[PDB]
XYZ file of C-alpha atoms in Angstrom:
433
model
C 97.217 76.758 110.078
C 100.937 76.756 109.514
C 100.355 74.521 106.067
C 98.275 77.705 104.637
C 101.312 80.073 105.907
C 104.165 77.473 104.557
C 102.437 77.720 100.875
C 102.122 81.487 101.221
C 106.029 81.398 101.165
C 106.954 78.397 99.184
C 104.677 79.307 96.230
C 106.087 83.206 95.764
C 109.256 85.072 95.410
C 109.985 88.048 97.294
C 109.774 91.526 96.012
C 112.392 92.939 94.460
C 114.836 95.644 96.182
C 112.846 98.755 93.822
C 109.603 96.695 94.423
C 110.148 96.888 98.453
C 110.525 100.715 98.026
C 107.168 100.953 96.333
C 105.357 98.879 98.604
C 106.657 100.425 101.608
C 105.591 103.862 99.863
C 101.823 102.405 99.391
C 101.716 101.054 102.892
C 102.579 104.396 104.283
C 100.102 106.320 101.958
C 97.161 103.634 101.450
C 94.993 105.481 99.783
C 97.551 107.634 97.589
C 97.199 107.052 93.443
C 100.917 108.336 93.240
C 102.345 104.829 91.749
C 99.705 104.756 89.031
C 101.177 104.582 85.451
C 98.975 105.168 83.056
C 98.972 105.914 78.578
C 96.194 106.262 76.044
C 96.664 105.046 72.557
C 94.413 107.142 69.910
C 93.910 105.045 66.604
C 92.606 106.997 63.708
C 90.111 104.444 62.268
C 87.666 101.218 63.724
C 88.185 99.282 66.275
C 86.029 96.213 66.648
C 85.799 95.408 70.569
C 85.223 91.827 70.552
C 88.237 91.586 68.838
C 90.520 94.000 70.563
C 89.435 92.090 74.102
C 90.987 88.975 72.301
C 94.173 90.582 71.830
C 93.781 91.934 75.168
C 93.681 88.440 76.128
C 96.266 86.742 74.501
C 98.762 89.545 75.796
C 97.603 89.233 79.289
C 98.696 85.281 78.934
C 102.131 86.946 77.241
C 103.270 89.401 79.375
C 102.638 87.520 82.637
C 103.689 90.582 85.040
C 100.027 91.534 84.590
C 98.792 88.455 86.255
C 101.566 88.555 89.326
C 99.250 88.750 92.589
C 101.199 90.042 95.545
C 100.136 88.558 99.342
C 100.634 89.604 102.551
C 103.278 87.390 104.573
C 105.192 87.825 107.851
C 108.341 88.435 105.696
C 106.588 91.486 103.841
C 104.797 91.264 100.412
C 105.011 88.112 98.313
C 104.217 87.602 94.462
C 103.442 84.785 92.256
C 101.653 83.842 89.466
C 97.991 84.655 90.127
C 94.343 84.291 88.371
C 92.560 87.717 87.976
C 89.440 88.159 86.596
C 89.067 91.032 84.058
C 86.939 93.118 81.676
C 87.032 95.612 78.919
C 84.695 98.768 79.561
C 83.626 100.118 76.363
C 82.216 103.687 76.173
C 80.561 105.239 73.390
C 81.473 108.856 73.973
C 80.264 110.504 70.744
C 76.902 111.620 71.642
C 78.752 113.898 74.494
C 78.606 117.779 73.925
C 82.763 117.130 74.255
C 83.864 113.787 73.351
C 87.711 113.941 73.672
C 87.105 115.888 76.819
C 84.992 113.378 78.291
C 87.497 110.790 77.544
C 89.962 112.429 79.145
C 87.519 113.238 82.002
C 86.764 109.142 82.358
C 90.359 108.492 81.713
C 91.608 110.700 84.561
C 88.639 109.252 87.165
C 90.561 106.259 86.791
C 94.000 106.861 87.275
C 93.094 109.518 89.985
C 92.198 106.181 92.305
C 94.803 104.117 94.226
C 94.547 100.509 94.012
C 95.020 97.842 97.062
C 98.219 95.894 96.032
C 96.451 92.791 97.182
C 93.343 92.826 95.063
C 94.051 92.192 91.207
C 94.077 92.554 88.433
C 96.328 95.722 89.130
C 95.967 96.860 85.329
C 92.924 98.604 83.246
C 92.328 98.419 79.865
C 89.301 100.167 78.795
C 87.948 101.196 74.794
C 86.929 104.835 74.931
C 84.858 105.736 71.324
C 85.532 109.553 70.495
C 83.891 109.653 67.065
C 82.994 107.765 64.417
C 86.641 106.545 64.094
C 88.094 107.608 66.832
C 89.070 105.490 69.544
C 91.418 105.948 72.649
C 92.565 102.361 74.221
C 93.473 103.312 77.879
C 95.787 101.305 79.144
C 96.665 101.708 83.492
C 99.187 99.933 85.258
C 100.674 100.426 89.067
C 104.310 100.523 88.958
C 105.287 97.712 91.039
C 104.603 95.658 87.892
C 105.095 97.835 85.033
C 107.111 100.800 83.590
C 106.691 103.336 80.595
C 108.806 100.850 78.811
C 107.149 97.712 79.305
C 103.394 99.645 78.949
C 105.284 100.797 75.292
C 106.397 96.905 74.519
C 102.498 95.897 75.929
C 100.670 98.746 73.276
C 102.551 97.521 70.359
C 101.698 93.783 71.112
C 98.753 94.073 70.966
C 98.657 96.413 67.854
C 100.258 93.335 66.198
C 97.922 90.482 67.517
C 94.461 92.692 66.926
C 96.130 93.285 63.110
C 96.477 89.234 62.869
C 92.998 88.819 64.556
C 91.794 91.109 61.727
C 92.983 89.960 59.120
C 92.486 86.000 60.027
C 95.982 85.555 60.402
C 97.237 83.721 63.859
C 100.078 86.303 65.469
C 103.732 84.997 65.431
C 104.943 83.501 69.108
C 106.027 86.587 70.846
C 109.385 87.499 71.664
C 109.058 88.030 75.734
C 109.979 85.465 78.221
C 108.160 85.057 81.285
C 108.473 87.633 84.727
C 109.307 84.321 86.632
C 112.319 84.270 84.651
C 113.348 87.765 86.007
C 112.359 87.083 89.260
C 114.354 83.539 89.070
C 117.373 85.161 88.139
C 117.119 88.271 90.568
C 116.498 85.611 93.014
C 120.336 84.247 92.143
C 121.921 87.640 91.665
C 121.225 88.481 95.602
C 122.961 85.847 96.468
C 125.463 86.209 94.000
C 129.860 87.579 93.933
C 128.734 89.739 91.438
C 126.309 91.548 93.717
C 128.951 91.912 96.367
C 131.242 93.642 93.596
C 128.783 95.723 92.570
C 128.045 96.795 96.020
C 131.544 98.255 96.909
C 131.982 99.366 93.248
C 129.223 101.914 94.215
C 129.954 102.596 97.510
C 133.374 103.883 96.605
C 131.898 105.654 93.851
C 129.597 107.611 96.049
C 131.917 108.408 97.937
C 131.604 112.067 99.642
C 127.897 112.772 98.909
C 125.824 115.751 100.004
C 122.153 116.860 98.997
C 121.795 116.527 95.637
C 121.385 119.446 93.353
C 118.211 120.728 92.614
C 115.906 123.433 91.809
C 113.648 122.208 94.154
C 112.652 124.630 96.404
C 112.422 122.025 99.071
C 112.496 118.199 99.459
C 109.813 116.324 100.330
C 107.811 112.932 100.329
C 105.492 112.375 97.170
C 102.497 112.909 98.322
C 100.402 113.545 95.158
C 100.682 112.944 91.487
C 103.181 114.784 89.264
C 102.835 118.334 88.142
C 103.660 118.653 84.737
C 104.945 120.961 81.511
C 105.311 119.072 78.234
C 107.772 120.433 75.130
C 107.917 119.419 71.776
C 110.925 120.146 69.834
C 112.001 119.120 66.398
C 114.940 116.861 66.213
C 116.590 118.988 64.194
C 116.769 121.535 66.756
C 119.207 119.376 68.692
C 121.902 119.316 65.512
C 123.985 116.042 65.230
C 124.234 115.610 68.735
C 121.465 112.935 68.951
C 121.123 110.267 66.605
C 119.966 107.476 68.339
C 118.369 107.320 72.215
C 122.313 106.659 73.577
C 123.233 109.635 72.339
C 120.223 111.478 73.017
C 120.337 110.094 76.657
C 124.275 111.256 77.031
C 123.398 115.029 75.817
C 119.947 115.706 77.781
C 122.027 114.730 81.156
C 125.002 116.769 80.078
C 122.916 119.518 79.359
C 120.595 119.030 82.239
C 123.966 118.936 84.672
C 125.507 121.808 83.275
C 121.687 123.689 83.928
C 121.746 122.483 87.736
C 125.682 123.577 87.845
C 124.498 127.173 86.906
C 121.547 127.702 89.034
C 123.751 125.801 92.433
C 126.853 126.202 91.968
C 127.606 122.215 92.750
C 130.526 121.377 90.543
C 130.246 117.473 91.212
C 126.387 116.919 89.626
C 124.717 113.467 90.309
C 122.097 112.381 88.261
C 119.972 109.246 87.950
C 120.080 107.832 84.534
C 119.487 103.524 83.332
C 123.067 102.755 82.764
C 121.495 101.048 79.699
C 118.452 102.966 76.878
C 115.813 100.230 75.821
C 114.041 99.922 73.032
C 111.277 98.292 71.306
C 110.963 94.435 69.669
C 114.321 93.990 71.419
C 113.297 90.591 73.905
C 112.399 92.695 76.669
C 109.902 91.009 79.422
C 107.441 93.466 80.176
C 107.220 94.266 83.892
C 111.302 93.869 84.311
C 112.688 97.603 85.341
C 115.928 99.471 84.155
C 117.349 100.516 87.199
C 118.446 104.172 87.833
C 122.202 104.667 88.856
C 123.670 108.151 90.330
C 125.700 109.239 86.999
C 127.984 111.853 88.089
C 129.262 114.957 85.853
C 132.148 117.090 87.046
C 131.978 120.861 86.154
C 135.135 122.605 86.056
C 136.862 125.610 84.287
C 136.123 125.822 80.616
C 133.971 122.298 80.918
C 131.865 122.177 77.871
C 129.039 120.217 76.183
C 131.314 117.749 74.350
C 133.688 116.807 77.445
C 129.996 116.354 79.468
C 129.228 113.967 76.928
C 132.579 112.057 76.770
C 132.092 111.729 80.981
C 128.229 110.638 80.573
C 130.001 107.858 77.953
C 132.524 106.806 80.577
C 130.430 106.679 83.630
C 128.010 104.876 81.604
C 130.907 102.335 80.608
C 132.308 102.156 83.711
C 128.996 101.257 85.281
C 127.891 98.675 82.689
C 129.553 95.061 84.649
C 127.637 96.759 88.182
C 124.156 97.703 86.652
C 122.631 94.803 88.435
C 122.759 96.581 91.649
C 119.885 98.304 92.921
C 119.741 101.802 93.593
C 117.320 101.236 96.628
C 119.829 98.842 98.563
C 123.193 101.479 97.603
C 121.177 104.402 99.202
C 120.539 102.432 102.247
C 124.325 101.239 102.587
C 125.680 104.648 102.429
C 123.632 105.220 105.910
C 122.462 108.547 104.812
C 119.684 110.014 106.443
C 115.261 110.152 106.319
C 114.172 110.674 102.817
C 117.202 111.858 101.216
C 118.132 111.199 97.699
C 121.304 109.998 95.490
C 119.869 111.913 93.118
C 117.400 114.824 92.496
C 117.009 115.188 88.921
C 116.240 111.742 86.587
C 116.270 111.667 83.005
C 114.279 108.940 80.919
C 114.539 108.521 77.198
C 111.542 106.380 75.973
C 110.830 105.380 72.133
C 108.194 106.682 69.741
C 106.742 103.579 67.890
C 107.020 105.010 64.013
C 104.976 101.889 62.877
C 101.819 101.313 65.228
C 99.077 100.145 63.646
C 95.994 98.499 64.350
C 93.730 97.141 61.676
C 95.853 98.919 59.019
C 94.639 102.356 60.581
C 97.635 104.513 62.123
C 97.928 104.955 65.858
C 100.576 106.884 68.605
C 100.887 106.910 72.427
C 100.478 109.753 74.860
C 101.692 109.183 78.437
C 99.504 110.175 81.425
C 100.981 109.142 84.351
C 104.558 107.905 84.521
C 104.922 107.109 88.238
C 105.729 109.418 91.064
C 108.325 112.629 90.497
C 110.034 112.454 94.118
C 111.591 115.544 92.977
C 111.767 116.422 89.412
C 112.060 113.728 86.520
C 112.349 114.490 82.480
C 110.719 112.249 80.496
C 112.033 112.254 76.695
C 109.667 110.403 73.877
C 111.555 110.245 70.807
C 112.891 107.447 68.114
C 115.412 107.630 65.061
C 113.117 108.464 61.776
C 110.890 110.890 64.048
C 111.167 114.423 63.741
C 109.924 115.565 66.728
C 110.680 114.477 70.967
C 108.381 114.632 72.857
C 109.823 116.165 76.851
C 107.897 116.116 80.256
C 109.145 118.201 83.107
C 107.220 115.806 86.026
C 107.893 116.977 89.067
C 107.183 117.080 92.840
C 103.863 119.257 93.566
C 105.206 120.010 96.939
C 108.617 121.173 95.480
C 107.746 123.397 92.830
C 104.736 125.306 90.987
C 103.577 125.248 87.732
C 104.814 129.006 86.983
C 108.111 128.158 88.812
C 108.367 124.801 86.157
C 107.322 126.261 83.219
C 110.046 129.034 83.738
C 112.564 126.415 84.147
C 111.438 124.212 81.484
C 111.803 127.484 78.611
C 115.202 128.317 80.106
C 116.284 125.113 79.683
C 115.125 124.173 76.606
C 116.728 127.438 75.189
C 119.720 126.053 76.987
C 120.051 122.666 75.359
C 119.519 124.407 72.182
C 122.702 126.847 72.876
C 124.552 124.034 73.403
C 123.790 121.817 70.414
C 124.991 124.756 68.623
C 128.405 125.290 70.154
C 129.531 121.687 71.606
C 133.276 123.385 72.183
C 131.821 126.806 73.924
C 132.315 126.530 78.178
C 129.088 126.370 80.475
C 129.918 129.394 81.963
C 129.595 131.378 79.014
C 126.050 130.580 78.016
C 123.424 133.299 78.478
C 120.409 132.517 80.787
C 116.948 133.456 81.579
């Protein structure tokens, strides 16, 4: 009856522009796990379960993104507040010939499955036992309601709540506002001058696309889960180019530009980049996205790895008053065509949480999944006061293999290192592989 439909509409708020992409991608491939995110947390001591679930608890109740429920409307897919029910596997694993590999074997059965947008709770949190004190908290998300950044915010919450359960302390108030908040003001920014400026800010700076650069050897739909090669490097290998994640951001898309300019030829580089670098216990709400803007880089004669890092600065600058407006809609208004791209190449510097703890026993994160690679995406893991990053080369399965990646990932690597060296030498003059 049209009362049941009127509530549908007047409880909810619509999806977001990125959200709409997603669910538009899940409706065309139901059954596809490709928008699963997904981390483990290993922590080097005891975990008590009952316990943990509490925390569990009170962060669900904090970080109310993971209790949005999304419904089905004549005017596409609606969200609100909803009331999942939930539970905590735990696994003893340590009387398995393999233990870690089992975990990882239980861990991947999970975030190998797609889940129906419409049937919450849309997150898993499960208590994996590895040996005597070793646990792995597995922690699975779908990205319509989370990122890497928020699932980073959501780990060390509840690191800090299970230490106060432990200890018989009650946690301080936490510092993240409510997702209704986020969609409340998204709500007003559609409607909004500012949204209208933004809009022909980045239409006239998009001006004269074309395919983007890539060392794809094709483009294509994501269709399956990322392929992936993982580096670490010491900080110290990167010089004094990088001390904090601005700075670290500004060099890995300089050098990532110049490495596209070499192997294409494209002078005019576009790469997607957050025109702001988050970080943790900063007020974040858990669930709200940074949203990726084409960053362009200009290559021409003698261009080197300082003046790429002065242009990252003032794109990023000259972006800042328009980062409200999403990349989804701008892609659309420049009328280009069926499944193309402002951008092949993403780059996405993430923090390293020096401090986690849980119980007093140390802890650290290790992504899984981190949401589909349309084409190929770098994922950089790295804080001030840690020596080493962490990079993952995600990428398309249809657009590359893993010998083709791999070869890519060394070359560049050795790249960036080149040209933390020698921040005055030209692009051009760099050896390759």
């Amino acid at each position: 009856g049209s009362h049941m439909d009127a509530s549908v509409m007047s409880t909810t708020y619509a999806l977001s522009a990125a959200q709409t992409e997603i669910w538009l991608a899940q409706q065309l491939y139901p059954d596809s796990p490709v928008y699963n995110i997904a981390q483990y947390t290993v922590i080097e001591g005891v975990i008590e379960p009952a316990v943990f679930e509490a925390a569990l608890r009170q962060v669900i109740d904090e970080a109310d993104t993971l209790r949005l429920q999304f419904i089905d409307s004549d005017d596409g897919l609606r969200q609100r507040i909803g009331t999942p029910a939930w539970s905590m596997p735990v696994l003893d694993l340590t009387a398995q010939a393999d233990p870690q590999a089992a975990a990882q074997a239980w861990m991947r059965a999970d975030y190998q499955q797609p889940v129906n947008l419409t049937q919450g709770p849309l997150f898993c949190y499960a208590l994996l036992k590895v040996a005597p004190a070793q646990w792995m908290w597995y922690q699975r998300y779908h990205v319509i309601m989370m990122d890497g950044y928020g699932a980073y915010l959501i780990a060390q919450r509840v690191a800090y709540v299970y230490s106060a359960l432990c200890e018989g302390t009650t946690p301080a108030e936490c510092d993240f506002g409510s997702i209704l908040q986020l969609l409340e003001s998204d709500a007003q920014y559609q409607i909004s001058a500012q949204r209208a400026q933004d809009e022909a800010y980045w239409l006239k700076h998009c001006a004269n696309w074309s395919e983007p650069a890539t060392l794809a050897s094709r483009s294509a739909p994501v269709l399956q889960q990322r392929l992936r090669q993982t580096t670490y490097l010491a900080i110290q290998a990167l010089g004094d180019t990088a001390p904090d994640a601005r700075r670290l951001a500004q060099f890995m898309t300089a050098a990532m530009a110049a490495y596209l300019y070499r192997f294409t030829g494209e002078q005019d580089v576009v790469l997607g980049l957050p025109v702001k670098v988050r970080f943790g216990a900063d007020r974040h709400i858990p669930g709200m996205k940074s949203n990726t803007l084409p960053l362009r880089l200009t290559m021409r004669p003698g261009m080197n790895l300082s003046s790429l890092m002065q242009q990252a600065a003032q794109e990023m600058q000259s972006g800042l008053r328009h980062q409200r407006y999403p990349s989804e809609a701008l892609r659309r208004q420049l009328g280009m065509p069926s499944g193309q791209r402002l951008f092949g190449t993403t780059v996405n510097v993430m923090p390293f949480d020096l401090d986690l703890s849980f119980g007093g026993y140390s802890a650290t994160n290790h992504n899984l999944l981190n949401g589909p690679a349309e084409d190929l995406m770098l994922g950089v893991y790295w804080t001030p006061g840690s020596h080493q990053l962490r990079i993952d080369f995600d990428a398309n399965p249809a657009c590359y293999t893993p010998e083709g990646l791999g070869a890519h990932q060394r070359r560049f690597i050795r790249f960036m290192q080149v040209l933390a060296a020698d921040a005055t030498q030209p692009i051009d003059s760099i050896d390759l592989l």
